Amino acid sequence: GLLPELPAV
Amino acid sequence: IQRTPKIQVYSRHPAENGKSNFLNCYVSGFHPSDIEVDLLKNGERIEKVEHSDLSFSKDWSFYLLYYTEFTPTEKDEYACRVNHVTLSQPKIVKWDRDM
Amino acid sequence: SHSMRYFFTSVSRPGRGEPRFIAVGYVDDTQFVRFDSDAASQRMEPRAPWIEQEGPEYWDGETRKVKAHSQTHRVDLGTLRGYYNQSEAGSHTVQRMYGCDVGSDWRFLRGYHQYAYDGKDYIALKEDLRSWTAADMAAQTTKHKWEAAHVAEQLRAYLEGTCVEWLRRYLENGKETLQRTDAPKTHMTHHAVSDHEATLRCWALSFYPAEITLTWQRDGEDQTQDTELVETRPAGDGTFQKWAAVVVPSGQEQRYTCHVQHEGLPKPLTLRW
Hints:
The structure holds 3 protein chains of 3 kinds.
Chain A lengths: L9
Chain B lengths: L5 E6 L9 E10 L5 E6 L2 E2 L4 E2 L3 E2 L5 E9 L7 E6 L7 E4 L5
Antiparallel strand pairs in B: 1-2, 2-7, 3-4, 3-8, 5-7, 6-7, 8-9
Chain C lengths: L1 E10 L8 E8 L2 E7 L8 E2 L9 H28 L9 E10 L5 E10 L2 E6 L6 E3 L2 H12 L2 H23 L1 H4 L6 E8 L4 E11 L5 E6 L8 E3 L3 E2 L5 E10 L6 E6 L7 E3 L2
Antiparallel strand pairs in C: 1-2, 1-5, 2-3, 3-4, 5-6, 6-7, 7-8, 9-10, 10-14, 11-15, 12-14, 13-14, 15-16
Protein name (chain B): Beta-2-microglobulin
GO molecular function (chain B): identical protein binding; MHC class II protein complex binding; peptide antigen binding; protein homodimerization activity; structural molecule activity
Family (chain B): Belongs to the beta-2-microglobulin family.
């Protein structure tokens, strides 16, 4: 299962 | 960055004339991802060719498997034709049938 | 050990439209999910039978998350174009990989979260899951942002907890294949180069996982000279292939032995012509 919140660069 | 593709052309199973098999063209080590890959039968493009979903290795270089179901014979010639921004002309690699 | 990894590629399309986005999920060397922005469904799709067990809530949740991932990468492409003072005319690539390993004890071993722009290292979470490796001054800007926002702490919570829980669930649900090793099927071929020389090729076929070692010895001592080792390659059915070759004097084939090491082999194999 994927990360719930991906950080933006 | 720009990295040229490595190319392997090979059968899934040991090749025997008249016995169904899969022809593979494995392209790897390349960047950027835009790439053109065709499988050839006697110099002519094969229509039913599928490929894997784009993925990449530890060093970020991409890899793809292109493949088609085929029945080898004594006479028919097979190859993989690859075009990429790093290549001045399309690279053709012939199926050697070594295993 | 076992691993769960997700790989993400986004490629900008300056001529028209939004970036091409492709996401793929692996457990060890088995792909189990995909998303492609160019495909019809616009859903996370299964690519192994054992994940098709998962119900509608799973597939809705992973679709929502993977679409959110897609949008983050679109934004990233814009952000990075700005950081590097590049024009809108060129196509560029962002890549991201993250995931977790469990060790031989079935507990968390390591976590990963790393990023590249145009095929070069950008930013990577170090093994301690508390610090960042920024490759250049653009990535340093991202590092500052992520440190202030406690990104490492959020990722660590996923990588040490939820990530390993998913991995364990998948490993059980798909155990019939995921926890089965396929030992390499091995044989040798002989290729005459001249009247005096010949190539011996040692084949390893239909193996899983992909990790393997093929070595040649002469009279029981390792040999690298006059050998060739090809890159491990997919057979297309989920297994892998590899070969190693050595050139030998004709009549001395008996002296040489190919040694094969793999997880599915209790003791390593020896082949001889």
